[PDB]
Amino acid sequence: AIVIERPNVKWSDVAGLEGAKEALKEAVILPIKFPHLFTGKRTPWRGILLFGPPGTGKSYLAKAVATEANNSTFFSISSSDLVSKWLGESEKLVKNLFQLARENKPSIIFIDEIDSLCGSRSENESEAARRIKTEFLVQMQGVGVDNDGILVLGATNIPWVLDSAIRRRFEKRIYIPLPEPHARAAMFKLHLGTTQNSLTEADFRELGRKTDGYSGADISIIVRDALMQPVRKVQSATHFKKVRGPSRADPNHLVDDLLTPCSPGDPGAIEMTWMDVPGDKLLEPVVSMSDMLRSLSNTKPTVNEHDLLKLKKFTEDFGQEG
């Protein structure tokens, strides 16, 4: 129904976003560290809008905030895109979400795709869409239950869809950009993980330098695709070559007659397919830089210039508290 976490994500487990982490520390940690700065006519900011182009992992960042905000508990629901068979009326969920947060202070509420609460673009909505909107607004404002110790972080890729009434409840609005080259280099290395490969550190630097405007989501697609190359190469080899190479079990031990895919005519190129290679004999190649480049060349960034401009427009013609 409603997701409950106790994240242990640290600031530094979020690649790049130096500027945004600064803004969050100031919007969220500072009032917590020094609540006396925010009394009388001042108050912390109950609502923080995380906005920017897709694929930057806003949620992941939100969990970092949860973690550093005194190990707050992280609660979420996700507003909904393509699914119709679904969660129709719907209203008491908002209520239950805010209540559970109130009971588990300190806590953070995270609402993804908070825009798809405005209900719909060129649809009605207009039924429970109304009932929900006021519900949400009711919990943001506060009944007699104060929401001291609850933070609301809403995430959206399309802040202009956002209904003016929702927006105004978000007093802090923090832009999350596509990643910078060093940060992309770091995400490639990450996503690869401990998948055996032969990329040098220069290769990763290179992959960084070459992905201006790719999102972390983008990079993941490129990597997943690259990961599938040993298998692809193995299933379409028409020939294999006897070679000696390391045991899968113990790299101290060299096995003497592994079989490895190779191009049709070659020193020792025996003709056979994977259906004739014994389980214990296959030696697949490892993920290579040319593998990564191939995926890269087959994948375009998701976000274009018209998108990023449409987002600048919002930052301008609203600012914070607009």
Side-chain angles (χ1 to χ4, degrees):
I2 274 175
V3 192
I4 306 171
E5 259 142 297
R6 276 130 51 259
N8 198 44
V9 176
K10 278 276 169 46
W11 292 125
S12 82
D13 307 311
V14 172
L17 300 170
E18 35 282 323
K21 291 177 213 183
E22 244 200 52
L24 288 165
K25 282 176 187 174
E26 276 170 18
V28 168
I29 310 308
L30 187 140
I32 287 165
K33 200 193 192 164
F34 305 119
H36 81 275
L37 292 180
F38 290 92
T39 66
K41 300 192 81 83
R42 282 166 258 161
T43 23
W45 301 268
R46 279 292 157 279
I48 292 155
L49 185 63
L50 305 184
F51 76 102
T56 48
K58 267 157 279 210
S59 145
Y60 193 61
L61 174 60
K63 282 163 170 86
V65 180
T67 304
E68 313 269 344
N70 286 353
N71 287 99
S72 286
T73 294
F74 187 78
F75 294 79
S76 55
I77 50 160
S78 32
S79 278
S80 294
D81 201 305
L82 221 74
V83 299
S84 309
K85 267 346 142 137
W86 210 271
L87 283 157
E89 323 233 278
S90 199
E91 164 167 33
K92 332 317 324 276
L93 213 81
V94 161
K95 267 187 79 197
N96 269 251
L97 182 57
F98 272 91
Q99 280 170 19
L100 266 150
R102 283 201 204 85
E103 283 146 18
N104 295 281
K105 304 196 201 202
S107 52
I108 310 269
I109 294 160
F110 186 68
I111 308 153
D112 223 345
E113 197 161 8
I114 200 196
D115 64 277
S116 91
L117 306 174
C118 181
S120 276
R121 214 209 156 166
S122 51
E123 303 196 12
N124 260 307
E125 191 70 1
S126 206
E127 260 165 50
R130 214 94 253 92
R131 308 287 96 151
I132 292 180
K133 202 168 298 190
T134 1
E135 196 54 46
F136 190 83
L137 279 139
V138 164
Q139 312 281 0
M140 294 275 18
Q141 142 68 18
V143 182
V145 273
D146 72 326
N147 296 343
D148 165 48
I150 268 91
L151 256 125
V152 189
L153 303 205
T156 180
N157 287 330
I158 66 200
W160 51 86
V161 186
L162 218 69
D163 173 59
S164 164
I166 302 309
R167 175 168 29 89
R168 312 187 153 285
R169 320 277 72 257
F170 285 93
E171 316 97 321
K172 287 273 155 152
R173 301 155 197 190
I174 293 149
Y175 181 70
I176 316 294
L178 297 174
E180 292 294 309
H182 294 195
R184 295 180 231 121
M187 286 157 188
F188 272 100
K189 196 156 182 217
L190 200 144
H191 284 114
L192 202 43
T194 44
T195 316
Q196 278 163 133
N197 64 79
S198 58
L199 311 212
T200 62
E201 209 65 31
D203 293 322
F204 296 109
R205 187 192 45 202
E206 207 50 34
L207 289 167
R209 286 167 179 176
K210 263 161 167 319
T211 44
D212 284 349
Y214 280 69
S215 81
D218 285 328
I219 282 168
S220 155
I221 281 165
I222 289 157
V223 174
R224 262 192 306 263
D225 183 46
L227 288 206
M228 232 39 64
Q229 290 276 121
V231 158
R232 282 201 203 104
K233 296 181 182 152
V234 166
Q235 76 211 163
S236 53
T238 47
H239 298 74
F240 287 75
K241 177 173 174 272
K242 284 207 180 178
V243 302
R244 130 141 152 279
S247 149
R248 297 187 280 257
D250 192 331
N252 293 330
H253 177 75
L254 294 93
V255 175
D256 249 329
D257 41 336
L258 303 174
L259 285 146
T260 213
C262 79
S263 29
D266 271 322
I270 276 301
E271 173 178 5
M272 53 198 305
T273 71
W274 64 267
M275 320 232 43
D276 327 292
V277 182
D280 78 330
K281 301 313 207 151
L282 179 67
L283 190 70
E284 75 284 10
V286 303
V287 176
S288 66
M289 174 80 279
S290 75
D291 296 337
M292 299 270 13
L293 292 162
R294 208 205 63 121
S295 293
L296 176 38
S297 87
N298 296 143
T299 300
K300 283 160 154 148
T302 284
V303 185
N304 63 41
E305 204 187 354
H306 182 251
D307 300 294
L308 300 142
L309 274 186
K310 197 123 86 287
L311 281 154
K312 189 156 105 289
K313 204 88 133 26
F314 176 94
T315 308
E316 263 148 39
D317 76 36
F318 282 110
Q320 279 92 160
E321 303 155 30

